[PDB]
Amino acid sequence: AWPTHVVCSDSGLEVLYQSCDPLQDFGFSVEKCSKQLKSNINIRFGIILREDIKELFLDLALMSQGSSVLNFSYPICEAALPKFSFCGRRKGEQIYYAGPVNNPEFTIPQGEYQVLLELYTEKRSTVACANATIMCSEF
Amino acid sequence: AWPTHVVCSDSGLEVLYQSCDPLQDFGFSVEKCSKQLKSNINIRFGIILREDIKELFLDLALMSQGSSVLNFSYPICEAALPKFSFCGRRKGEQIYYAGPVNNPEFTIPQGEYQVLLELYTEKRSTVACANATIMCSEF
Amino acid sequence: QMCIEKEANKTYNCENLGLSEIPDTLPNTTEFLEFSFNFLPTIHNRTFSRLMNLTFLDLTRCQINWIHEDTFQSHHQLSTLVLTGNPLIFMAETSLNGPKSLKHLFLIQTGISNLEFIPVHNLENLESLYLGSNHISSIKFPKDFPARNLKVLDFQNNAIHYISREDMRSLEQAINLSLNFNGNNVKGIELGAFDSTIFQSLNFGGTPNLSVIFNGLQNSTTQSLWLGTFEDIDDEDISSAMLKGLCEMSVESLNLQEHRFSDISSTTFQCFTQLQELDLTATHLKGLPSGMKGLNLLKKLVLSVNHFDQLCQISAANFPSLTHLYIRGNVKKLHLGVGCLEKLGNLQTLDLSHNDIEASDCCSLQLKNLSHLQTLNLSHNEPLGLQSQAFKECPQLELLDLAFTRLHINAPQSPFQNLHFLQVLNLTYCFLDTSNQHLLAGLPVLRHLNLKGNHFQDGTITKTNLLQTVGSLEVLILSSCGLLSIDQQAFHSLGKMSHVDLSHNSLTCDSIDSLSHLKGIYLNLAANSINIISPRLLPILSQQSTINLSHNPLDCTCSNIHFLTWYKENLHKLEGSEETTCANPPSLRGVKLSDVKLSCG
Amino acid sequence: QMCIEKEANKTYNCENLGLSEIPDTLPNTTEFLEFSFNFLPTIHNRTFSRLMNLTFLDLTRCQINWIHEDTFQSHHQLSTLVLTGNPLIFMAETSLNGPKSLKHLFLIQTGISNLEFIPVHNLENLESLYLGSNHISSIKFPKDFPARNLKVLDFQNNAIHYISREDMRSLEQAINLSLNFNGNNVKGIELGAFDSTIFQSLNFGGTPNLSVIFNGLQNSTTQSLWLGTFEDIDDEDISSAMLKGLCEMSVESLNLQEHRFSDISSTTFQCFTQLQELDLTATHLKGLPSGMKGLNLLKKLVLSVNHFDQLCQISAANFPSLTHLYIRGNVKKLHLGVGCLEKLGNLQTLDLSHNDIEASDCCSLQLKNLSHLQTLNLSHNEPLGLQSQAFKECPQLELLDLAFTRLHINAPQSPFQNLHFLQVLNLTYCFLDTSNQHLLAGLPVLRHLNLKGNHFQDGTITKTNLLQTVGSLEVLILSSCGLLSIDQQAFHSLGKMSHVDLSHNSLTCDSIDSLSHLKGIYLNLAANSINIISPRLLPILSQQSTINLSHNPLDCTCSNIHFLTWYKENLHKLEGSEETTCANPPSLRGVKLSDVKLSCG
Ligand SMILES: *[C@@H]1O[C@H](CO)[C@@H](O[C@@H]2O[C@H](CO)[C@@H](O[C@@H]3O[C@H](CO[C@H]4O[C@H](CO[C@H]5O[C@H](CO)[C@@H](O)[C@H](O)[C@@H]5O[C@H]5O[C@H](CO)[C@@H](O)[C@H](O)[C@@H]5O)[C@@H](O)[C@H](O[C@H]5O[C@H](CO)[C@@H](O)[C@H](O)[C@@H]5O[C@H]5O[C@H](CO)[C@@H](O)[C@H](O)[C@@H]5O)[C@@H]4O)[C@@H](O)[C@H](O[C@H]4O[C@H](CO)[C@@H](O)[C@H](O)[C@@H]4O)[C@@H]3O)[C@H](O)[C@H]2NC(C)=O)[C@H](O)[C@H]1NC(C)=O
Ligand SMILES: *[C@@H]1O[C@H](CO)[C@@H](O[C@@H]2O[C@H](CO)[C@@H](O[C@@H]3O[C@H](CO[C@H]4O[C@H](CO[C@H]5O[C@H](CO)[C@@H](O)[C@H](O)[C@@H]5O[C@H]5O[C@H](CO)[C@@H](O)[C@H](O)[C@@H]5O)[C@@H](O)[C@H](O[C@H]5O[C@H](CO)[C@@H](O)[C@H](O)[C@@H]5O)[C@@H]4O)[C@@H](O)[C@H](O[C@H]4O[C@H](CO)[C@@H](O)[C@H](O)[C@@H]4O)[C@@H]3O)[C@H](O)[C@H]2NC(C)=O)[C@H](O)[C@H]1NC(C)=O
Ligand SMILES: *[C@@H]1O[C@H](CO)[C@@H](O[C@@H]2O[C@H](CO)[C@@H](O)[C@H](O)[C@H]2NC(C)=O)[C@H](O)[C@H]1NC(C)=O
Ligand SMILES: *[C@@H]1O[C@H](CO)[C@@H](O[C@@H]2O[C@H](CO)[C@@H](O)[C@H](O)[C@H]2NC(C)=O)[C@H](O)[C@H]1NC(C)=O
């Protein structure tokens, strides 16, 4: 198993993640840690690609308590619509991204949250796989 | 030591080299190839630097029939005169060089030759070491 | 140890095995080899020498530092070499000599800073050169470098800021060249650098200044020009003054995605007269003005991912020549309005998917005057109330996509009536009332129907059913319909069928009876409840060309003996053979049927 | 296993070992560690846990891909981290947290494409940032990047083509910064990006267009401005028009090496009015125009590697305030002429080495009126004839270098007479006539004399010799002189010497006699013919501070016992102990005198 990395630990909320891809680990960071996040937050992402990301899709599963709150799929890179500059980069390339993700200005209540994130190609080949935990407390 | 590389091997003209630096090999390549060595010839060079080349010097020894024909030392990089664009580059850097050497036009007659080339720093630390063999015949 | 086999003596995958050399277990006749993520610090005249018949070599991320003299001398049939992501220090002068016709070379992210790095005298047959993600700021190739066969030249994610005449002259031998400058920072181009050179595609994705590109592309000829930006790149708004250079250009297709327009007006597109296709995806459009000049002869228009409230806001009168219109995934909920596209007489293909379109009465007022329409995509929308003859205004329609859009249709109305030319009808997850026997009436030439995700009464298809009106059907999909049984006569009015998909239901062997009157079909019975297939049903299976029986709780006992011997004999007819496993006995649970050899008497 | 010790419990070298971890043998007190060319794919918080006192860490080319959280948390002492040539994929946000004062960071050639890659949280105390050979085309640092203490910012061999106001704004935190843009292709600078700015050094080595640079640096202040090109970079000839911007700049030192001048006239240097130093090395100059305005207040001028025939061609009238003049390695044979430098009344240093200068009578007519001269370099030239008071025109001379330049001096003349201020005299390989007893007369304050490579008659120094006149001497080098014996009273009138070099000769133990009156000296007797050292000579050696005896054919038998015991007692005084060897017995030759132990009594 890959080690668990600390994204946030700012006296209150703790964000942890772990790679579920057996082949490799990856790096991920945020610019700032808070209970209240602004729209279009900035992330940092480092990885070796195991597949061409001409077409890339994200799967998200957010869990609170035990009730599955939210499943969604979203395309990040597409033949008809490359949303980001790194779209169309190829297998074996080392990627580094520092920029926004498209997120609504939203706030999260207190409690424990479990998150699964999968990035995959057209053939459903794994680019990235993440097992993440969010712990929020008093303020 | 290290394997022997071919610089030239067309009708007559026959240039081989071997690295005498136990730590590493390096890549060397010439543009054209003829008995008439034209002035300001273009070379191709590839190496990992095991030292800073802020100050770099070359030793050349030309030999045939078991006797020295030509000795010289010449500076390639100096603080007061960095001759080339790659000067001042540091330990651990990969260098690639393709360009002129500013050599006087040599006339190499028929015979068997051995060339020893040394690139070294102000500390006399080896950057590169070449053990070269030239076999020249009728044209 | 060991490699994955994908074809007899032909294709092998050795990815991620951490090998220092080519396994001596791999056969001599290996043509396609995936050797990425292994460990080859130096490759030489001996490393691949025993696999002389290689055609495709992928050496991605193998940590290659040296490619020595005559490495590929023996490999006369090598067509594709992938060296992406290797820390290459030096390539020998004869390192790529050998292959009679080396077509594709991938040197992406190899640390290349000088184009002189590439060994020149065996690149004559090269069709693709990929040089992305290196340290390249100049595209100037050395002299002696051939470009006559070159069709794809990729410089994605480099640091090219300036393009000169002499830079481009090294490419004069090429015609129909695709150049990719995506992810660069071109801030200057020598005026008329691209003169008389004929390009297939030019990509300047993420380019800082559009003006520089347009001005610099003066007197040039290209089919496709990609000038889109991205969500992560900040751009200045596109003024019409920036788009002037298009008049001095030969362009067929143009992409301007993710850009924002500065005060969009009637003359904004005046230089677009020679253009066939225009892609304005995610261009923050709230609408287009009427009386727009220079778009009169445009054939294809993409307005996907914009901010329209009603279809009339696109001002279709601007585009009388249009044959293809794509408006997919509008950011707002899209309203169709009344006759918004009536002035589009020549339109053949309309895509209105993913728009949250909601209409209680559809679609006569909405698709008014669309008499040339052949392809209509209305899938992934909110519910649509269909009248009888819902598509009266599109008589010439050949393909109708309504997948995942709930349809409110009243019994016994026929919404698709008088579509005498319809061939393809996709109704997956439309929540149809399948008890309406007239639903598919008035489609005399329908040959492809998708009823995936629909419910049937009692989970059964009886003798009198929906499909009786579709006697010309060839492709039928009934996957994920929760079917428990199909009547043996339920497909009797369907004599022409060659593709039947019944996967992801709960059918048993009794379902095969409904196919006895058919020959040479593709039969998909995957993910069902089939365990024993009685020998009386085997001749029916023998009539068919290709059968899938995977993910079935199949019985591997003596009670199912006849089928098991049949299975092994007809292995050429079987799709998903390695996913076809036993459920009983518990002793064989997970075991492929092709491995099973039973004995009785 | 096994590392090399450079200082006990302090400085260790682990280079080229192929270690995957820090060995258990490295002491806890290690402060300086060179760990380059090992194998550390991922470094974490335990990697260097057992070496908490590190101040210098070299991790060059260890194939580091990951630096995890809190890697140096327990390293308060870390001052220099060298990460050059590692393929870094990701660097954790807290990965450099720990060091109370991290002053020097090296991220040269690490694949960096975005300056956001560098963790900012513990860079407040950074003085040196090295970011060369990456994929960097913009120098814009993030908003939360500390630069207040930053003194050196190195961007060598990157892809910076443009410098904006927004780029330079993120560096406004730094005061007196040294920016290195060597090997970059700066095609443009936003006009006003360097407005009101003050820098220590700006290096634009190899820049395509100088006009662009001068243009962009308008209203900026620099101490040093390095604008030279290189032999492998194509030259655009510098006209008077290119140098216009210098009139609107504050520059103290200018370097224009390897550049060419055309059309070169008395107006080329009109803007140079406030340069203090100007370096014109290898600028293909055949001379400098006279009556020139703009070099009136110049202090230092380098005219090395040019094409002068005559010294008068440099037009010395242009530089009245000049204090330093360097003309080294002239491409043509250089001639001194008559009174060419007579207008350089304030000149302090003159360097004219490596020019093939030939002068039969020197040096009054050549150095006329150089009465303020303090340092003169005439080394590595063709032979010079010197009569008595050869340097009469330079009475204030303190250092005279004539090394490797053969001198023609007639006995009994004293060329160096009346040099009352001369302290250092280098005469190595001057082929002097040492039998001339008056050679060094008139030097009351000489303290450093180098006579390396000179011949003494019969290879012997007599009681009466040339050295008698220089009784104030402290340093003497008589190495490589082919000496066989020194008379015991040859250095009698030299009772102030603290450095005697007598290496590479053929002296025996009897030569040590001449050193008896000396105490606390550095004595080098390496590579001689010293065999048995008489017990009378050991009191002489014991009086000295440090003594070298390497490469000598010493006696290691019972006849030389007294010296052998003295040796093992005085290892704190011995230079090159591990390099000293025996000659006899034949089998025991090659063993260090510290290891050799005999049996006598
Ligand atoms: C007056 O002006 C003088 C001349 O301009 C100044 O002289 C300089 O003095 C400095 C400091 O003392 C000295 O610096 C040292 O350099 C060491 C490396 O040396 C290399 O270069 C020299 C010089 O080469 C030039 O000259 C020769 C002979 O004429 C010529 O053949 C060359 O082509 C070259 O000339 C070309 O370049 C110059 C400059 O660009 C042009 O002006 C000229 O036109 C030509 O184009 C070489 O001789 C050396 O080569 C020898 O040594 C190395 C080992 O170091 C050997 O491997 C090699 O084979 C060769 O060996 C031969 O000589 C030795 C004895 O010397 C014999 O044993 C052997 O058998 C051979 O015969 C080198 O290539 C550097 O290592 C050293 O570093 C040490 O000190 C520094 C701090 O100072 C520390 O950091 C280190 O730890 C070291 O301890 C040191 O820096 C220069 O060498 C010398 N310069 C010149 C040009 O001669 C003088 O200083 C000045 N005086 C005053 C008061 O101002
Ligand atoms: C009419 O228009 C419609 C819709 O526009 C067209 O529908 C397309 O149909 C084709 C073929 O049937 C599909 O292609 C196949 O795609 C998969 C990859 O699928 C991934 O995307 C799926 C769609 O995601 C969108 O829609 C969903 C559903 O509402 C939504 O939640 C998403 O957020 C997303 O919508 C967003 O993006 C749109 C476009 O950018 C916007 O318009 C919209 O507004 C939104 O912003 C998605 O469902 C799927 O996720 C599921 O599936 C995977 C398993 O694969 C699973 O892991 C997940 O958990 C989900 O269950 C994916 O993210 C691809 O794998 C296929 O590739 C195979 O086949 C091709 C050949 O076709 C081969 O080349 C390959 O080798 C490979 O074998 C295939 O390309 C397409 O997805 C679908 N598009 C959309 C947008 O729905 C329809 O074709 C049009 N009709 C006609 C006649 O032209
Ligand atoms: C509805 O069914 C049709 C027909 O099977 C699908 O149309 C295919 O769409 C893709 C374009 O994305 C084409 O590559 C194929 O050629 C089309 N097939 C045919 C036969 O025309 C369509 O994708 C289905 N709709 C949805 C939403 O899944
Ligand atoms: C001749 O000897 C002198 C003195 O030993 C050398 O001068 C030294 O040069 C260095 C730099 O080259 C200066 O920084 C030192 O200060 C000088 N030393 C002293 C004691 O003044 C000179 O380099 C020698 N010349 C040659 C050609 O080797």
Ligand SMILES: *[C@@H]1O[C@H](CO)[C@@H](O)[C@H](O)[C@H]1NC(C)=O
């Ligand atoms: C409908 O389109 C036809 C051309 O196909 C045209 O003649 C007619 O005027 C259009 N009608 C309306 C109402 O726009």
